[PDB]
C-alpha cells in the first residue's frame, strides 16, 4: 500500500505554506490528500514546518501516547499547524470542515529505522 512514514506525510505534512489563510483551507486539503475518499475523516492536523523539523521531534520530549504506548514525543517548541475538524452538519460525501490555524507543540508517535513519525497524536 503506503509505508507508515509515507502515510503520515501524506496526511499531515504541508510545508509549502506557512499557515492556512482561508476558511476553505481544510475543505481543499482534506479532499486533495484523499482523506474524504470513503468517508469524511473527522479530525486531521496539517503541519506547516519542514519535514526535517517534524522528524526531529522523535528525539525530543518522550511522553505517553493517548493509547498508553510510550513511543510519543512532544516538540520542545511550537510549530505552525492547521487543525481540520468536520462540522456537525457535514455529511459524506459532502464533507465540510472547520479550519483552525494556530502555533502549538505537536505530539507524534515514532517508529522504525530510521526512527520517524508514523502517527499524529495531538497538538498542545
Ligand atoms: N489533533 C489530532 C488528533 C487526531 N488526529 C488524527 O486522527 C487520527 C485518529 O485520532 P486518535 O488519536 O483519536 O486515534 C490520528 O491518527 C491522526 O491522523 C490528528 O490529525 N490530529
User: Cα(113) to centroid of ligand 1, in Å?
Assistant: 23
Structure-solving method: X-ray
- Cβ of 122 less than 6 Å from ligand 1: yes
**For residue 25, with 0-12 CB atoms within 10 Å meaning exposed, 13-18 middle and 19 or more buried, which class applies?**
buried
How far is the CA of 123 from the CAs of 5, 72, 77, in angstroms? 19, 12, 11
Q: What is the experimental resolution, given in Å to one decimal place? A: 1.8
Cell of 123: 497538538
Tell me the three-class secondary structure of 31-94, residue by residue: HHCCCCCCCCCCEEEEECCCHHHHHHHHHCEEECCCCCCCCEEECCCCEEEEEEEECCCCECCE
**C-alpha 22 to ligand 1 mean position (Å):** 22
The DSSP letter of residue 19 is S
Grid cell at residue 56:
526531529
- Contact between 122 and 102 (Cβ < 8 Å): no
Q: How many CA atoms lie within 13 A of 73 on its CB side?
A: 20
Domain positions in the chain are 1-124
Q: How far apart are alpha carbons 98 and 14 in whole angstroms?
A: 17
The C-alpha cell that represents 8 in the structure block = 503520515
120 lines ligand 1 (CB under 6 A): yes
CATH superfamily of 1-124: Ribonuclease A-like domain (3.10.130.10)
Q: Residue written as cell 502515510?
A: 7
For the CA atoms of 34, 58, 43, 2, the dihedral, rounded to the nearest 10 degrees, stands at 20
Closest alpha carbon to 75 in 18, 111, 12, 117: 117
- Cα 49 to chain centroid, rounded: 11
**Which residue minimizes the CA distance to atom 1 of ligand 1?**
122
Residue found by looking up cell 504541508 in the block: 14
Distance 122 CA to ligand 1 centre (A): 7
Distances, alpha carbon 17 to alpha carbons 14, 51, 80, in Å: 6, 13, 10
Amino acid at each position: 500500500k503506503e509505508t507508515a512514514a509515507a502515510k503520515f506525510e501524506r496526511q499531515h505534512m504541508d510545508s509549502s505554506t506557512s499557515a492556512a489563510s482561508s476558511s476553505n483551507y481544510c475543505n481543499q486539503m482534506m479532499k486533495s490528500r484523499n482523506l474524504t475518499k470513503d468517508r469524511c475523516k473527522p479530525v486531521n492536523t496539517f503541519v506547516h514546518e519542514s519535514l526535517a523539523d517534524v522528524q526531529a521531534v522523535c528525539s525530543q520530549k518522550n511522553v505517553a501516547c493517548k493509547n498508553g504506548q510510550t513511543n510519543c514525543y512532544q516538540s520542545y517548541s511550537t510549530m505552525s499547524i492547521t487543525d481540520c475538524r468536520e462540522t456537525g452538519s457535514s455529511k459524506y460525501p459532502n464533507c465540510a470542515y472547520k479550519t483552525t490555524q494556530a502555533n502549538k507543540h505537536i505530539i507524534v508517535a515514532c517508529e522504525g529505522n530510521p526512527y520517524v513519525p508514523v502517527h499524529f497524536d495531538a497538538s498542545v
